[model samples]
Each structure stands twice: as C-alpha cells, then as structure tokens.
Target: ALTYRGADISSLLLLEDEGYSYKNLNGQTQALETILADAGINSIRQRVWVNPSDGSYDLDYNLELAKRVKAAGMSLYLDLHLSDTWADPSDQTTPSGWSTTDLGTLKWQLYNYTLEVCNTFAENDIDIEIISIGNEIRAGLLWPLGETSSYSNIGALLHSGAWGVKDSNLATTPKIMIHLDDGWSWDQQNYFYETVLATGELLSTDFDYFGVSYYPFYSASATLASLKTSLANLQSTYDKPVVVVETNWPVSCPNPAYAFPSDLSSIPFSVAGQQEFLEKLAAVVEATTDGLGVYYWEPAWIGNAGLGSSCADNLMVDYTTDEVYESIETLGEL
Candidate 1:
C-alpha cells in the first residue's frame, strides 16, 4: 500500500569507485542513499547484470548494498538486466554462455539464473519488494535470435522468472514488473501489452505491475495536460497500476551528446528548467488515478569525479569548475 516515490541508484557503486562525488550547501560529501533519502526518496532501484567486467554489481556486492539501503529504511526494487552489460530496448545481448543455447535451453537458463539469484537474496534475508523481470524489454531479451516483435518469448521468459521468485519461498513473492521505455504513447503501449497479453498464460498468472520509462524527449511532445490524459487512458486500457520507473531531464548537455532535435532546443540548460519539469511531471503523476509514483532516473548523477565524462562537452555542471547547479532538493520535500 506504499506510494512508489523512489530513485534508481543502479550505478552508484560504479560511480563511487570511479571517484564520483556530489556537493551540496552543507559542504559535506553525502552518500548516494543519504542524498536520495533527503530528496523524499522512499525506495531505491538497482539493476542486476550477470557478469559485468567491473564486478562491482555482482550478486555479492548487490546483497551487501541492499543491506545498506534497508538500513536507511528504503524499499528496494531489483531490475534484472539479463545481460553482462547494459540491456535495454536497443540491446539485449545474451551473456557469454547463453549465446549459443537453443530457445528451450535458454528458457531453462533464465529460470535457473533467476531462481538462483532470488534464492541467494532470500538466504541472506534481503528484503526485496519489487522485481522487474527485465529492463525496458521492448524487443524482448537475450538477443540475436531471441529478440522478437512477437511477445511469446518475452512473456514466457517473464513467467519463468516469476515462477522462480515463487519457488524461492520467501515470506512474500515480490511484485513482478514488466518495464518498457516510452510511457506516453498509446501505440507503443498497445503493441507491447497487446503482444504480451496475447500470451494468455503469462498475462493471466504473472506480472503485478506495468513499469514504463517516461522521458519526454523520447516518448512524445506532450505537455502535462496531454501526459495526464495519456496516463489515465493507459491505466483504463491495461487495467494495471502504472509506475514511472525511469525519468530525467538534463539541465544542459552539449549538441552531439544531448542529440535532441533542434526544434526541441527551446528546452534550456538551466536549473530552473529542470526543477520546473520535475514539478509538472509530479503533478501529472498525482493526477493519475492508478499512478503509483515516479522514480527520477539518476538524480545523484552529478558531474564531479568525472561522472559525466562520457558527455563532458554536453553536460550542465562543469565538474572541473566546482559548479553549483541542480540539487536533489529541487524535487521538493516528501
């Protein structure tokens, strides 16, 4: 019965180890969890990849961090990326061993891997409240051959993962979520869920929530009014509770890096703009009857410590200059 207000700290550990830093008026370095909690964040989401080269987000590391998140009294949501690296709509590469496996074998791998991960967390007594079967699975997961517009493979895989959670025998089976990227469009939602619902077995017995990532730049050119209407329509159409599982706006990022159309360049690189965007988005969420809550994609993703080096030329804050730009406080108090 809890509200869904939260943030995803998927790459916190990676950032921390890479000399990432955040600055506030307090002049003290705040940890990621502390920053999120201060921003009215009630829950934290982390993504799990099978074998990332850095080895920082592995099961052992995640469990250890989960304990820290729990200590802060933040609920946790686990997003299984199902790839050794990033897994999203554009890329869902299978892990090393899964590359050559048949669909049947791959399904078994999905179940066993999911079961093992859940069981490990259960054994450690980690309290996970939500589990997203995969992240932004628009084209399905475990790519090359498995990527499909047909939802059969994706739905079955999700069901297999959900079954694993139930088999883990925790005090409660965590709510299962099916996540997609664009939240504002009826067409994308229709294509995804209609295909998903086609698998009657999976849709009937699995999935507790529909998670969508609503990035205005990618989703659609809808204002708050239109966004609210879209949300209400989707809630009625899908008959499922909705969570804005991922969202964020850049205060400023350069041309090539930001890569937004020139027509949308009216969006400025100012802190005020970012704050206004969040406020309006929050209002729309509150207006939606079945809207759970919004998770600001990466609020702690400051420029310091080379955090935004990947987009240095196009970023808002100049980490090298000790810029005082947007802070989590802009999101307003809980």
Candidate 2:
C-alpha cells in the first residue's frame, strides 16, 4: 500500500481529437479517469505552468485536469515549472515580466506566485498532496537570479516558495519535494543539494522528499544497480523520502527516432519490454529504504504517430492509447 502507481497527466488535455479514445482493460473505450483508476493507480502527478504563450497547460488548463484527478478520488502531486515554458536544465527562461527582475524581488515574486497558485488550488477544493518547489531544478530556476551559480540564491528562492507551500491554507499542507535531473549521477545530485545545505539553512526543514528524473535513452548508466546505489546514498545523506518522479522507455519503437537505441539491448522494447522496465524499476525502488515508488512520465500521451512528444507506442495499450488496463492491471502494480 505504501507503493504508489502514479501518472503524470500533463498532456491529458492535448489529445485534441474525437477519434482518439482510450479503451479499458476489456478493450472497450472508456473515460480517461475510469481507465486510470481501474488500473490500480492511486495517485496523479501534474505539471503547473505559470504562463505559456499557448492556452494549453497554463494554470487554468492544468487546474481543469486537476479537478479530474480529484473527481476520481486520487491523490494529487503538482510540479511547479516556475517558467513560461519548459523550465529544465537546458533553458530556464524567467517569465516575461520577471525576465530582468532583481534577485531580491525575484524571491518574493516566486513566493507570491507560489502562494497565489496554492491558494487557487485550495479555493477550488483541489487539495494537493505533494508539491515540487521547482521542476528539475538541478540547474536552478528563474534564469540568472535563481541559477546554480550561487547556492545561497537557490536557497533563498526555494525557501520562499516552499514557505508558500507550507503556509497555504488547506486541510493538509502538501509535502515539499526538491527535484534534480540526472538521477543516475549521484555526485552531481550530491554537490547541488550539499551546496544548498551549506547556505546556513537546513534543507531537512524545508523539504520532505527528493524527486529525480531518469531517462535510460539519454544515460547509459541508468541501470538498476546504479539507481539502487544512488538512492541508497541519498536516503542516507538527506534522510528523506525518495521517488522517481519521471521515467519511461519506448516499449514500441515505431521508428528509429523512438527506437530502444541499442538492438543489443536484451529487453523486448515493445509493450512487454516497457512492462519489464517497470518491473525492474520497481525492483530498484523496493531496494531503497526511502523509496516511495516510480511514476510514469506521460502514460496517456498518444496522438500523431510521429517523432513528437505524444508519439504513440510508449504505453501498454495501443500507441494511441488503447487502454492497457487489464494488461497493466495484471502487472500487479509492480
């Protein structure tokens, strides 16, 4: 029961086609919530974008999906991007208004924005169970001011935002999670978090959990033993819960672009291959003392059969989401 099969519903609003309907375990098309709940998933993870040029995935749109997650009686996890678009390691462009804002004001801006978002969720009665202060902030957040150059700046920024999370008026304040990229690279994760800790502030006081992203396609070292060792190290050092916030393998490589990368790879790299990846990933988590479980990045993102983000073939059901409920259900929530 401690293990959670969570899904990131970031792209749930994107399959803009009446023709696309996901089937249930019995292969009969069903509503999205029904299919997910029946598959033994108990929690939902969503990304929150403060300002996106497009209407989709913005605060309003993500809140719409958050309502669905709540309606289905599932726990909610919110990932705050702190940017207009993607706020990852490569590019952390500050929102247009805060592009050139000073660091001191930026901290307050982050806090005010964070509090506003949290209050919005609370007012809507969508109680968030977990909140990531920043999305993959291994590099940092909000561009120059919040970048990784100074741990003190990172500390101030996170401290303010996490305060918003804790101070939000809700039945239960959300658990704070600090995320980092390259989960396989333990030393990098260590240095970043260590720097934050040395800022005359206690990370243990502000954060309850640590989240990480893992993509086997990008990192050859993303192995089970590698994860187990890294997780063990983190649990020992940080003394907090750990969860694989994002992970996926192209089970059905429709094209070379989405191929499993190495034919020499032993896994089937199809539906069953993806399932094997899940099972193996579970094994790695189960080995860690602080491990909560793993979450699939975007299990339902299926649309055009191309090299785009929502390309079909990664899920257990059809690449276009045929509903692997039973197929996934039979996996025993590994």
Candidate 3:
C-alpha cells in the first residue's frame, strides 16, 4: 500500500456550516475535500462518536463524509472513539447508550456495535481502509469497564473490536489500528503496548498499525527529535508500521491557549513555520523504517467556533483570508 498522507476533517461540515470558507491557492472557492485532494492528500480520517447529543460526530454524519472522501479518490481512515464524546488519554467516558456495568456484556456490545458500523459502511458502498478501534486509548476505552488497570479487560475489548472488523463482509477488509497519545514519550508507548497487548485476548494479528497523536504544543517533551526516536524504536520493537495519525502546529502564536515554547522546535510560529514543521515531521516519518504517514489534525478547522481554542490557530489556512496558506500545498509532499 502507498503511504497515507492524511487529514482528520471530522469537524469540516460543522466548520462550513459555521461560515468557514475554504479557498484554493488561486483564490477560487472550492470544496475543502477538493482543495485537500489537489494538495496530494490521499487519505481522510474522520472521527465517529457512538452518539452525540447534538447528533454530530455520529455514525451517520461520518458515513456521509465517507462518500465525499471516496468520491474525491481518498481512502477513508475511520477513527471510532467508541464513546459518546472525546476519548483521550485522560478521559475515556462510556457512551450513554451502553450503560451496562457488566464486563462480559460490554465486550459483546463493543463487538456488535463495531460489526454494525462496518457492515453499514460496506452496505453504503463505502470502503474503510483503516479503522482505529479507539482514539488515544492509552488509558483504555469504555471507561471503568475497560480501563488499562485491567489489561485483560482492555485486551478483550480490543479483540472484540478487531473481531468485528474482520467479521464484516466488506469488499476490502480494513486494517485495524490501536492509537495512543504522546508519541514522543517512549515510557508511555512501552507501558501501553507491552502490557495491554501482553494479555491473551488481543494478539499481534488483531492490529495492523501503531497510530499515534503527536502534538508538540500540548506536550513539552514532544519535540521533533523525540518523535523521530520514539517512532523508530516503536516500529522496530513492535514490527508493525507506525502512523502519526494526529498532529498539527499553529500557524501563528498569538493564541495563548495553545502556545508552546520555542525549544520544541526551531520552527517559528507562522504560516511558513507551519509548513516547515510539517515538512520536517513528514521527513522524519519517511526516514523511519515502515513509517506509514502523517495526518494533520483538523487542517480545515478555522474560524472561532467549536474547538476553536485548540484548533483555530493551528489551521492549514489563513483564518482571516479563508484561503489556504502556502503550507496547504505541501501537506502531503515529503
């Protein structure tokens, strides 16, 4: 398979609805997907929540985006958070739908729900090339029932999700990924993969890639050098290709909410800086053995709307111009 130059545009529809416009280098207005595809991005990652109260980030919403991605000739990397809302290292709240306290029943629910999601996508003529079982699941998913303290429980949940993917009768089987946060931290990576996967339920065959979310602004330790070393070591140790599934650098530094120290990288906090940062980040991944690719998290998410604080400044376009920055063209280029 070719390397996946990807972007997580899960919030795209919302952004557009909130009056965010995406324009091309020629200053011509175009669909964000069209702009991205033209820029050499070959894959689109969309996050799906179990059931959001606002009806956003749900299965149906992503299924619609999947059609747009396929039509644009990009592979779909479906990130199933397996929760009602955000599922990160610190927070992995269970969905409101699955209120069961029983571990056995929860495992079954994971399998069945995942199976249904895959089946529905296939039925809709959408081929999901990569399916992340859970998002940044170092702490484990489904809250207390499948937290990392119980390795066996987390492993069982993982296997059940993978089983669902394998059992789906899609024309193309999707590769499963186990995503973790803080890609620069070797200790966190070792502890999560070594311990959870050591459990008998989830074997090496259950997953195909090590997906990581590397955000430099969020972590003081996440530098270019640290990420390069960590990813290289992880690939060699696990013997699986690694993907920097989520990453982004701010185009400007005025947004104190996501400010980072200059020492994280010599790259300046400007549009040119964002471009250089991604170029170097991609280069690092390409140099690593079996490094799959990098995905810019929420590249099209500009304007002051939902998640604006975290992603507003870290966009691929000029928020004021509503036009793509020069960096947009190099997003997928090595």
Candidate 4:
C-alpha cells in the first residue's frame, strides 16, 4: 500500500533544453517527465530558490515547471532552498534580498517570502503534493539567523516556513517536509530532530513530514545497510512520514564529468549498478513503517546540464547501450 517512486526533475527542463530525452522501456525516446511517469514514478520534485542569481528556481520559474509536473499525471514535491543559491550542510548563504536584515527581520522575511511563494503556487493551480521547508536545512537557512548551531533560531525559521505553507490557502494543502542532508547517521538525524524538538516552537506541530538526502558515494553514506539504523530510529521516534528525498548512482566507473574518482564498490558503478541502487533503496523505504518513498536526485541530469559531478554525468544514459539497462521504467514492476 506504499509506493511513490519519484525523481527531482529540477533539471528536467535544463536537460531537455540541453537536447536530452529519456528512452522508454520500449526503446522509444519521450519527454523527460513522460518517461519517468511511464516508468512508474508517481511524483516530481522541484527546488525553489528565492530570487536566484541564475534567474531560475525563482518563484515564477518554478511555477512554469510545476504546471508541467502536474500535467504529466505525477505529483509535485517542492523543495524551498530559501537562499539565492544553494543551501546545504556546508553552505547556507543568505539570499541577496534578505542578507541585510537582522535575525528577527529575517524570520519575518522568511515567512513573507514563503507565504508569497505558496500563494503563487495556489493561484497558478499547482498541485503541491509536498513542500520541503528548506533544502537540507540541518545546517540552517537564511544564514547566521537560522544557523542550526542554535536550536531556537533554526526552529523559529522552520516554523516560519511551515506557517507560510499553511497560510497559502491552496485548494489541496500540501504535506510539510523538513529536509536534512545526512541520512545515514542515526546520531545526526537524532541530534537534528532532538534539538528542534527542544525548542518546541512552531515546528513540532507545523512539520508534517521528514525529508532526507542519501548519497552513498559522497561519503554522506556508505551502504544501504548503513542506513538501517537511521530508518529504524527516526521511524520509531517521529510520527511524520519519511522520504529519501535525494539519491543517485554512476553508470560508469570514472564519471566523464569530473577528475575525482567515484566509487561504490557494492554498487558496481554501471547501469546495472544504478538499477540495483534504486532496487535496494526501494526495499528499505518500503520496509520502514512510516517511510513513504524515495526520489532519485537529478536522474535526468546528463551532458552539459551545467552539473559537473562525475557521478551525475556518468549515471544517466545520454548516448549509449547503457540506455538499454533497467532504468526508471523497469522499477515499475516492484
């Protein structure tokens, strides 16, 4: 009764613009979202960055894309990065518009921006299946003000985003997801949620879902086995459902995208390995009591999408026999 395999097709358009398309299991090339949907994927995740310098991932851009996601007969997952650029464990810079504000003012801005974004989605008839408050905000968002080092500040900021979504007044309100980066370590997950729980701000009631990013090759994770404890602990501790919000694999040993060597010994570093990766992750999430599903990060990110990671570039089939392997469509059987 639980299966919702999806992908963060944030780069879906970029890949299309870059002249990339997916091969349906029947060996026919189709629109990116069409392939993923036909392959049994039920949702699409889009990341929203506030007034991004690159001119994309901003509110309006996301609205345009969100429409396509819904039209594809799939659900939509919104990841709100809150920064003008990337915001993860290592870099959570403040967006240009909110950089000058003090902590208190920044919290209000967080609320205002989120309110506005959600309102925009609703006004456009975008069916948001889920909304991540802040992308990988285990480190904090909006910079020094929402930095995770201090539990209360981050907690307040999260509450702000949550309230923003609630106040948006969508025809079908979305489930709120509070995202974190390291999904392998039980200690890290416990610490993050525990700290927030202590603050006991708007979060405990506001956050309706838990989101995690798991990449075994990035040193953020080692094996699916390594994540077992993390699942059990968090599943037992939190009532909110969990989704492995991000994960990916390499279809080649040394990805052509970069100089660094990518390795996942257990994963075989090939198209088969990629399939095995999704196959295994699906098992884990399915086994977890509160686990909803998992989404492969940028499964369509191939050749000149401006993403230069070896793993990312090596993973997708841009032009090759590797395209014949059990890619997205094959996962439908499970």
Clash count (model 1, backbone only): 2
Clashes (N, CA, C under 3 Å) per candidate: 2, 3, 0, 0
Which regions of candidate 3 deviate over 4 angstroms? 255-263, 304-312
| CA RMSD, predictions in order | 3.5, 2.8, 2.1, 3.2
Best by TM-score: 3
lDDT of 2: 0.75
Q: Which stretches of candidate 2 lie over 4 Å from their true place?
A: 16-19, 254-264, 304-312, 325-327, 330-332
- List runs of model 1 lying over 4 Å from the truth: 219-226, 254-267, 302-327, 332-334
Query: Once model 1 is optimally superposed onto the true structure by TM-score, how far is the C-alpha of residue 21 displaced, in angstroms?
Result: 3.9
lDDT tens digits by residue: candidate 4, 10-109: 8666556666566766778667677677768888889888777667778877887888878889899989888888778878888887844477788788
Q: Per-candidate TM vs. native?
A: 0.86, 0.91, 0.94, 0.90
Q: Relative to the unseen true structure, what is the C-alpha lDDT of residue 174 in candidate 4, on a scale of 0 to 100? A: 87
Q: What would the per-residue lDDT of candidate 1 be over residues 290-319, giving only the tens digit for each residue?
A: 777777665554433223322222222335
Badly placed stretches (over 4 Å) of model 4 are: 18-23, 99-101, 255-264, 304-314, 319-325
Q: Provide the lowest-lDDT 10-residue window in model 3.
A: 303-312
CA displacement after TM-score superposition, residue 309 of candidate 3 (Å): 6.0
Note the Cα lDDT for every prediction shown: 0.70, 0.75, 0.84, 0.74
Rank by TM-score (best first): 3, 2, 4, 1
Per-residue CA lDDT of model 3 for 1-334, tens digit only, reads 2298889999888877777777898999998898889988899999999978997899989988889999999999999999888888788988886844888888888989889999999899899989999999888889898887787888999999999999997888999999988898888898888897677878988999999988877656677788888899898898999999988787665555544545555778778888788887888888999998989888777653223344347778777788888787778674
The digit string of per-residue lDDT tens for model 2 on 1-334 reads 3377787857767773446667777768776766787777778888887777886577898788888888887788989888888778988888878745588788778878878888888889888888898899988888888777778888888998998877777768888899998887788888888888899643669889989987666545666666777888999987888988888766655444323334326776566677777777777887789688777777766653222333345555566345663446523386
Candidate 4: worst-modelled 10 consecutive residues by lDDT:
255-264
Using lDDT as the yardstick, the better of models 2 and 4 is: 2
